[PDB]
Ligand binder design. Sequence first.
Ligand SMILES: [Cu+2]
Ligand SMILES: [Cu+2]
Ligand SMILES: [Zn+2]
Ligand SMILES: [Zn+2]
Lengths: 153, 153
Amino acid sequence: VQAVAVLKGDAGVSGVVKFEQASESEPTTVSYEIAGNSPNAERGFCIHEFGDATNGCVSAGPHFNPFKKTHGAPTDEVRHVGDMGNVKTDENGVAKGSFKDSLIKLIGPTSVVGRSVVIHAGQDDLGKGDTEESLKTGNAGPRPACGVIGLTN
Amino acid sequence: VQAVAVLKGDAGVSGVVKFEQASESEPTTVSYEIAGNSPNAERGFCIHEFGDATNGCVSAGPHFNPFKKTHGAPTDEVRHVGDMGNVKTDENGVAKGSFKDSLIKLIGPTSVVGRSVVIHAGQDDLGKGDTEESLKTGNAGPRPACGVIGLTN
Ligand SMILES: [Cu+2]
Ligand SMILES: [Cu+2]
Ligand SMILES: [Zn+2]
Ligand SMILES: [Zn+2]
């Protein structure tokens, strides 16, 4: 399977995020290319529950979290399925790279197809800040861009 | 289940299309509200295979047709699963209404979640024109707007 999300908004940020998973027990390879960000920064990157774009990135809902855990880092045992942490932007505001993840899936009951990918205006505190918003969201701030994960070839 | 698609493009046409199905053997209720069309006209309305928006409405691909049939009318025995025929626009270019369909589904192997909904600039010939494009597409013309069907509550 292959899925893709075109990130858009009215804040100068835009990008494309690709997903690929061969079989359900296999890890998904997420590849991203995102521009218009603040230079040399770290930005919260995550999958939200709804692929609803009726109201900007707002209608995307909360973090995709079928197992009802607290927000954490991609490498934490306890994290939301949709937690992809922070992407690093370069001298020109571009975030580009890829990684594999064992929780994010395109196949099965927790598939991310039809959900949203969101790029934040701030840095995710990886659930390590010591407030309650930390365990909820990671305090990454506003959602400048987002996109519904659709199927493709 | 409930799904939604926000139709967009650079041609003045925009809209919202909602989908709802309770159980898989039950018919899906499609509801639409679309503006910016030519007044008092009929426009081809359909679900395309891919929810890829990387290249306008082009990257949506061909009509969603898992059973490899020819293009036809929503009430034809032979039609593509994604064939929703023509929507009627009013004196102000608005298409608004709803209907139920037994082939379109949000549940199961032929789910339309993660695929695209496309509004055409022309009228669908319901596969009754006598050319080869008729059985392929319905000759509905350009795709002024489109959107990926995402999940919602
Ligand atoms: Cu987020
Ligand atoms: Cu079409
Ligand atoms: Zn989270
Ligand atoms: Zn068709």
